[PDB]
Amino acid sequence: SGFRKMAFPSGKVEGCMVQVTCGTTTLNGLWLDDVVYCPRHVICTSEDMLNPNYEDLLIRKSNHNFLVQAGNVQLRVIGHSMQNCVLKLKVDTANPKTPKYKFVRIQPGQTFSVLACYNGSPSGVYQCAMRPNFTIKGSFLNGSCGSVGFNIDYDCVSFCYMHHYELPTGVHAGTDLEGNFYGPFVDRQTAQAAGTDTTITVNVLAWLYAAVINGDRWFLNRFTTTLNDFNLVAMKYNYEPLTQDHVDILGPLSAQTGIAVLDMCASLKELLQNGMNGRTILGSALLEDEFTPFDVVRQCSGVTF
Amino acid sequence: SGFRKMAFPSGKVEGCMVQVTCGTTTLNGLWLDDVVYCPRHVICTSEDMLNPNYEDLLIRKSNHNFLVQAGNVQLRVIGHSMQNCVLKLKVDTANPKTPKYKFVRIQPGQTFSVLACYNGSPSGVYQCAMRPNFTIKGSFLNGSCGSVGFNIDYDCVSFCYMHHYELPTGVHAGTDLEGNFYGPFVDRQTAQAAGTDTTITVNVLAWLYAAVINGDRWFLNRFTTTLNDFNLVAMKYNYEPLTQDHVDILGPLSAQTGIAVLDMCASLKELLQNGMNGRTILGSALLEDEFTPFDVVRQCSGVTF
Ligand SMILES: *C(=N)[C@H](C[C@@H]1CCNC1=O)NC(=O)[C@@H]1[C@@H]2[C@H](CN1C(=O)[C@@H](NC(=O)C(F)(F)F)C(C)(C)C)C2(C)C
Ligand SMILES: *C(=N)[C@H](C[C@@H]1CCNC1=O)NC(=O)[C@@H]1[C@@H]2[C@H](CN1C(=O)[C@@H](NC(=O)C(F)(F)F)C(C)(C)C)C2(C)C
């Protein structure tokens, strides 16, 4: 029993983390094979960041300007290129701790573990969701950029996120490992708006299923509803519309618990319309949308790596 | 910015995790130097667990009965002893990934990272608090026993917890690494009561400090109060009394924010007496007591390892 916000083991990823210094600026890099990936804004001074010309800034840099450190050991940079908002620094050494990995672009509503790092050293691990507006609600300070988000499939690390930017609202934006931002964001120190955010409806239902599994069943009603009837209510309370693809994804949880997806939608309707009456669900006084169906199955049946 | 439930990096600990099988029963062991630590109830069949005589059960066991596996590799057990509720299995090999470590007995209210494992393989990481009643609110299934809780100080792992037991209420109990339970618990399959739990008052204040740092300040009043005046209210709402040792521990957070500890106590009094009125603090609709002062400083100023 129990249900927590649980990150992947970070070991495989801790071994890829390096420090990248250019002039005065230091942040984190990801060392895979003979290549180090970091945010391109490492080349900036503080004045450049207000409106940088990254091409012109990079032109004024050679390989010896890039100090890459892995623990106490320096790596010799033998090449450099800019791919979108990331820098690829070729080094003379393949990382001997390179795990099996891939680069993926994650869809909104999916989750990942963040290994938050400073000076190329790991500080902490937590789980995030990519929000419908392509922000994340992270925990990041000066020096955190280059920190990555990832998923693990048995022994294969899917890197999906690298950290670049904190919005005025204190939420976060970054890129995939090819340097393409998630959302409308750019790497310049200026106030930038995120969308109106929505609630990830499929995740909420997954978490209701996690609650039932763990015995919290007070919210289960006898009533039912349609897909259409539910979505009309969902629109009202700023929830993602529920698709059939979503219903089918919730199938494992439906199957395990013996509560149809549409009956669970019935429960959520009542919850939205009546509130919680000061009661809790899995220790939460509000409705959590940062667990995928797979996160719930993984945790409530104990998938390992 | 941002503030999340953040565990230590788990790499150092992932390297110490092994699988221990006795007869039919399999759980996790902790492999440090030439010694493997696991819960003693690995020697039990399902019938024994209702009321085990651990001494008599262990007597009928020799070294070859203990299958210890580290990945695909078997370790030859050359000795065995029972220390309280843990089994120490001497093996022929020192773990080459043994980190600097210590064993500590943690105080109620303190936090730690759990690396939840099955079949000696890591599944995930989360943070827990030791509750005043010596239970933890974990996420644990069949096979999770042997999973450990730990803290990290630069490069030194303090192991403080090993998992044994889930109460009827779905919370959890276990031992230190010398096999002494936290709380009144025993390793037998019988319903066991935990204390009335209390709220860890020092942690709540630490988390209010985390909120202010992050810009949640709506709950700040310009009142202050005495220590005694606060404690009177605290007793009422089932909060731990606040001591001067507690005030002194909050000194760094007081210092960082420039809000006196007793002015913050003023805010918490009003919060307890009025409730939150549907408002949130760091995304939470209730008051969180599972962050220590050190956890807040670690996160809101970026301590690494
Ligand atoms: C990477 N090390 C940081 C991550 C930041 C630091 C504070 N918390 C974080 O998550 N990246 C940056 O500092 C980037 C960097 C210049 C400005 N920047 C920002 O994140 C800034 N944001 C904005 O300008 C704002 F608020 F308007 F959106 C900052 C004020 C420093 C938080 C560049 C090149 C974009
Ligand atoms: C270790 N592998 C498990 C951890 C459990 C399994 C489900 N969730 C957990 O955290 N340990 C056990 O199964 C221990 C073990 C026998 C029984 N036991 C229990 O935790 C049981 N609890 C009780 O008897 C209860 F609820 F009354 F307190 C169980 C019902 C299986 C959850 C021994 C030797 C104590």
Residue numbers in the entry:
A (entry chain B), B (entry chain A): 1 to 305
Could you give the paper's own sentences about this structure?
The emergence of SARS-CoV-2 variants with mutations in Mpro raised the alarm of potential drug resistance. The X-ray crystal structures of the representative Mpro mutants S144A, S144L, M165Y, E166Q, H172Y, and Q192T with and/or without GC-376/nirmatrelvir provide a structural explanation for the drug resistance.
M165 is located at the S2 pocket and forms a hydrophobic interaction with the P2 dimethylcyclopropylproline. S144L, M165Y, H172Y, and Q192T represented some of the biggest changes in both the residue size and the enzyme activity, with a decrease of ∼127×, 39×, 13×, and 10×, respectively, in kcat values. Similarly, the M165Y mutation also seemed to lead to diminished interactions between the oxyanion hole and the ligand, indicated by the lengthened HB between the imine nitrogen and G143 amide NH (from 3.0 Å in the WT to 3.6 Å in the M165Y mutant). In addition to these effects on the reaction center, the M165Y and Q192T mutations also directly impacted ligand interactions in the S4 site. The M165Y mutation pushes the terminal trifluoromethyl group of nirmatrelvir out of its original position in the WT complex, disrupting its interaction with L167 and the T190 backbone oxygen.
